[PDB]
UniProtKB/Swiss-Prot annotation:
One of its GO terms (biological process) is defense response to bacterium. This is Kappa-stichotoxin-She3a. GO terms for cellular component: extracellular region; nematocyst. SUPFAM superfamilies: Crisp domain-like. The record marks I9, K11, R13, S22, L23, Y25, F29 as: Important residue for binding Kv1.3/KCNA3. It comes from Stichodactyla helianthus. Negative results: does not show or very weak activity on Kv1.5/KCNA5, Kv3.1/KCNC1, and Kv3.4/KCNC4 (IC(50)>100 nM). The synthetic analog ShK-192 has a paraphosphono-Phe (Ppa) at position 0, a Norleucine at position 21, and is amidated. It is stable at acidic pH values and high temperatures. The circulating half-life of the synthetic mutant is estimated to be about 30 minutes in rats. However, low concentrations of functionally active peptide are detected in the blood 72 hours after the injection.
Amino acid sequence: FXRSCIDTIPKSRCTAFQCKHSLKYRLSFCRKTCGTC
């Protein structure tokens, strides 16, 4: 089992802290903000 690059949570949640402490953000929720896409 598997769209484009888009999050499921209010981008307003992806903070410079989540993109550094939370990896799932740089490869799950923050698939654009962290410029990971």
